Amino acid sequence: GSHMQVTLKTLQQQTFKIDIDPEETVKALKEKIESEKGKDAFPVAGQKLIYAGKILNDDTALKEYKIDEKNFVVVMVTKPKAVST
């Protein structure tokens, strides 16, 4: 409807269920899980997403990856590694 739901796996051996507007970008789907699992474990500036082999984008809308309520997506984290050089 006005929102759509997705199943999410993580690098921490768990799975969950969430819902967002399917015409928003990955940025919306990625920000909303930090509200549940925290900056200390899933920092927005340093987390990433995969749809079973596809490389998702914070600047492309969720329906263009054709994600489905009966399939799942995987989240990953790098902190980020941003340091002075």
Provide an overview of this structure.
This protein has 85 residues and is an alpha+beta fold. The chain has one domain (1-85): Phosphatidylinositol 3-kinase Catalytic Subunit, Chain A, domain 1 (Ubiquitin-like (UB roll)). Helix content is 14%, strand content 31%. The protein is built from one helix and five strands; from the N terminus they run ββαβββ. The longest helix is centred in the middle third of the chain and has 12 residues, at 26-37. The chain is globular, with a radius of gyration of 13 Å.
Give me the CATH architecture, please. Roll
Please give the alpha-carbon distance between the first and last residues: 47 Å
Strand portion: 25-35%
Largest sheet: 5 strands, mixed
Order of helices and strands: EEHEEE
Counted up, domains total: 1
Protein name: UV excision repair protein RAD23 homolog B
Family: Belongs to the RAD23 family.
Subunit structure: Component of the XPC complex composed of XPC, RAD23B and CETN2. Interacts with NGLY1 and PSMC1. Interacts with ATXN3. Interacts with PSMD4 and PSMC5. Interacts with AMFR. Interacts with VCP; the interaction is indirect and mediated by NGLY1.
Organism: Homo sapiens (Human)
